[PDB]
């Protein structure tokens, strides 16, 4: 109606620590076909939200989420609407499905002007992250009109295989993360590069092992690949697509700078309150949340927050709150979205457990302080990947969070979509007014 980007001067939000239950998560109303029955897992979820539109993707598998048989991959876009209540809802306007559900891997969506542009890898050897040597570089673009039009040719849906990929020293590159940004007529997608370990230049003396008893200086370089002797190391970055250029589509890989370097992992870049922000999943020993203002997009340098309160579950080598270099490849993607630049306040869903993917908690937090939070499920509810995007509905900050969750009544793993308004008051309605 009035759903737009988080920009300008939003209505006030609570900026102090409180135990009051001011967060009131709601399951959001949607037309996305993301409900099922038992026997199937809905995995590989993607959510993007932009300028009152959204993009969404998943892979439906028969059986296990990791080992099941690929049933259906969908990429869908739509509008974020007002259901009449000044509450957001998601209406899907355009859905694309490939004939082979198993060959599309690692999609990433960026919005521009009429379309969501979704960049995906194409693989016949499974997950390129797990079959790095076998996978031959193959990327495709699925362009979808957010408002389809009849008798428009390829305006509604356009598929294009991309052959010209500028990757510099890397052998191969691919999208890695849910969503990116536009700057003018150029799109940037979160991405990763595969670089042979033999070409990786790293001084082990840069690996911070002070006050870390059990750490060896080699641990940072060894943990830049999926195991200590991996043929490749992984480096996060961006894939640049300039819509203004004529002809044969060219993508260009832009590696992330080496400040607070960790293994290439699903990331996202987004604009909030006038500037790009980056989140990088912590898939190794540096387990505190990695997010910050993007200093420069190309070359890519992120001013990582010194956040001391949000982490992610791992196993015992790199469990939650680990900070010392170890050789490990583990963790979860749980992003956060800047909603107040002056005080650097963010909103996102974290998993409140040290070594188990469970207990999704929606939190509003600063670098060194969680201000307020609310659980999204009963305790010991298993949950893994979370994607949070925030926006304005008539100048009020709302967030939509995708949570990959075990559904009890419908005994399957699937994404659930929560809408959460950020309140203005630090006390909840009626607090202290109901007697005792
Ligand atoms: C969840 O993990 C916390 C681990 O903190 C620690 O960091 C990891 C990387 C390992 O090196 C652990 O060996 C290390 O303890 C743990 O909390 C910490 O607890 C220690 C004492 O046990 C305390 O000195 C730290 O300040 C504290 N840190 C934080 C950020 O809380 C959790 O333990 C729970 O919370 C503690 C405060 C204390 O009540 C513990 O008894 C309690 O179990 C741990 N949670 C669980 C449920 O294991
Ligand atoms: C890496 O690629 C190889 C080659 O495609 C995969 O091996 C195939 O695995 C399927 C599934 O079990 C078998 O049906 C084929 O017979 C295998 N082909 C060959 C040539 O061995 C392997 O599974 C892939 N690894 C991962 C982790 O996806
Ligand atoms: C995207 O491509 C356009 C060209 O199509 C770039 O715009 C040009 O920049 C050069 C400077 O090297 C000028 O000489 C041209 O006149 C510009 N053309 C237009 C139409 O503005 C643009 O800079 C590219 N964007 C990015 C981010 O690389
Ligand atoms: C984080 O701390 C370091 C201190 O070593 C400082 O140089 C850096 O500017 C801090 N980052 C932010 C975003 O404040």
Residue numbers in the entry: 176 to 611
Sentences from the paper on this structure:
The henipaviruses possess an attachment (G) and a fusion (F) glycoprotein which together work in concert to mediate the virus attachment and entry process, but the precise triggering mechanism of paramyxovirus fusion has yet to be defined in detail. The henipavirus G glycoproteins have a type-II transmembrane topology, containing a short N-terminal cytoplasmic tail and a long C-terminal extracellular globular head. Distinct from most other members within the subfamily Paramyxovirinae, the henipavirus attachment glycoprotein does not hemagglutinate and neither binds to sialic acid, nor retains neuraminidase activity, and instead binds cell surface protein receptors. Recently, ephrin-B2 and ephrin-B3 were identified as the functional receptors for both HeV and NiV.
The high-resolution structures described here, including both HeV-G alone (2.2 Å) and in complex with ephrin-B2 (2.7 Å), combined with structure-based mutagenesis, reveal new insights into the molecular mechanisms governing the initial steps of henipavirus entry into host cells and into the paramyxovirus entry mechanism in general. The HeV-G globular head domain (174–602) was expressed using the baculovirus/insect-cell system as described in the Materials and Methods. The structures reported here indicate that the HeV-G head domain dimer is dissociated upon ephrin binding.
